[PDB]
Subunit: 214 residues, 3 copies
């Protein structure tokens, strides 16, 4: 069982937008940014952290900081999960296939890293699409280490109620003194407008710059 | 709204249109890093607002080429005599937005005045569409939080969705230039690489050449 | 003469991707685009010295990669998943005077010369034909379109009907100078049922290699 609360649509300043983005104007949208990871990378090295759980956790912290990232339709109602957990890809080198695992979120990165590294240790070699099953309150992260993309765009055949956010990380590279990571984010318009993604991406850049590991 | 109904039998894109309305139907999104170096310097030196200045160049381009003005009206494909920019207004206090259209005019200064009136009169109204929506719009959306390398719109139902959608990003310095992320979504039935590329080459031009009159 | 190409039926029961393929043909069905600024510095120099047209030459490189890896060569044929023996580039041709376009396929060969002579005939015989598909369409093609107007940082295709749409789509943009490099926008759309991030990335890393290592021969 998982906690949620209910959006009151008749009182919401997005009532009209939600109603249209749920019917005649339904749409999802993707955007890519070359994210500045110079500081964050130095940090992850300084502390001997694995890049990937560290990045997944800053995203998870953001999904867990604004309610527009945690929306679902539940038995006909718009709801906001009290938390969301990251569901991230793991690559199997031998079969050339992937799985998605999810790890329980906590604010303290240290506590999350321990749960993550444990999840990878027990389920990493399990070749199921979803070794742990899937839960209803997650968001997606995938690592695409081969390609320093300028664009990454998802075209999901059925977007009905697909409100979980989907992030895709690209291969970081050098650009003068910086390390730039390509970062794409797909969201559904019924639950995020440009303002939500934009504030999130700004706070993500900032957090990457100011977090001090641990 | 006046229009011209297309003579399909004589149209060189007859088979295209027909494939792009059924079996091959599709939409496509493109982003470019527009160079607004000269455009911005023009805007500041003449104390214009950037957004209506840009909307107006978008809006001249859509009104110079018919592929941007097509629509399906009562089972017939039609070209509008003109199309009117439908642009976003952000409400900082509720963190929501509205989509407002302003009557296009050729002269910039006529346009800026209808735009200023529109935004003064309806800019606090929180309706999704404060003026409702008319048949002949194209869409312009502003995104100044993000200097994106890609913006991509995936509409669930693209049937007869012929109205172009531009999405503007956060401009930035690079070397000595000012670049601005600019994306365009079109439907394949009414525009091909060429029509979108010609358009974008013209945009770049009209920006480097605009005089502020 | 016609070439009817051979194929192999996929035993889905021995395929490591079976669970995925079945999710991505139903509840998770999706497609995805990605764009790269391809580094074409060595390739363009090679092309200029040996006086080739750029397009047929790039198309041939793409063709070689689609024909090096079976995930690019899948199709549903009479209700069954199959790998084509090989696939042929179906590429665009721009008609200046009507401002229209066609899609033309040319039969693939391993050897550039063989291939450049096929492409040149096709382009001379059909280059002016205003038909959407001057040569019709055959069952085992991949797509390439040239988009020489625009140096995009993104291009992506949103197909309304993706069922069984397994043929890769490539889009090339207008090349440009970045310091000493010559870069070219290159985008690829694939269907997730037959390609994962790994397939597509391996391919794009190989495409770069091949572009830098090509000898005009
Ligand atoms: C086919 C389709 O779904 O297009 C939808 C999608 C639409 C192009 C459009 C109206 C407008 O807000 C749009 C904005 C620019 C508004 C602000 C930015 O967020 C966008 C990134 C955004 C994308 C698409 C969009 C959402 C649509 C309309 C027109 C409006 C009509 C009604 C009844 C609400 C539509 O139904 O046609
Ligand atoms: C509506 C839709 O198609 O979303 C689908 C699509 C889905 C978002 C998703 C689960 C997950 O792998 C996804 C990944 C991130 C996984 C890794 C990267 O490759 C991506 C490029 C990728 C894109 C979409 C995707 C494939 C879906 C789910 C969640 C549960 C998965 C299953 C099989 C039930 C879903 O159907 O809800
Ligand atoms: C699944 C789908 O909608 O793919 C459609 C979409 C299609 C891939 C394709 C044939 C071809 O021109 C295409 C081009 C490359 C041609 C030139 C470029 O403009 C585009 C960047 C472009 C995008 C998609 C596209 C339009 C399709 C076909 C091919 C079969 C033949 C006909 C007559 C429709 C199709 O339906 O199979
Ligand atoms: Ca919180």
């Amino acid at each position: 069982i998982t906690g949620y609360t209910t959006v009151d649509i008749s009182q919401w300043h997005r009532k009209e937008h939600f109603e249209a983005f749920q019917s005649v104007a339904q749409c999802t949208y993707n955007q890519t940014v070359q994210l500045d990871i110079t500081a964050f990378l130095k940090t992850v090295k300084k502390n001997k952290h694995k890049f990937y759980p560290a990045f997944i956790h800053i995203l998870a912290r953001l999904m867990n900081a604004h309610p527009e990232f945690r929306m679902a339709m539940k038995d006909g109602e718009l709801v906001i999960w009290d938390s969301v957990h990251p569901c991230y890809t793991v690559f199997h080198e031998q079969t050339e296939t992937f799985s998605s695992l999810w790890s329980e979120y906590h604010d303290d990165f240290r506590q999350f890293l321990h749960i993550y590294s444990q999840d990878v240790a027990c389920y990493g070699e399990n070749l199921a699409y979803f070794p742990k099953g899937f839960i209803e309150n997650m968001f997606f992260v995938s690592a695409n280490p081969w390609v320093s993309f300028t664009s990454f765009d998802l075209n999901v055949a059925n977007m009905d109620n697909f409100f979980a956010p989907v992030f895709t990380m690209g291969k970081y590279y050098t650009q003068g003194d910086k390390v730039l990571m390509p970062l794409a984010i797909q969201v559904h318009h019924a639950v995020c407008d440009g303002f939500h993604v934009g504030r999130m991406l700004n706070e993500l850049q900032q957090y990457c710059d100011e977090w001090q590991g641990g």
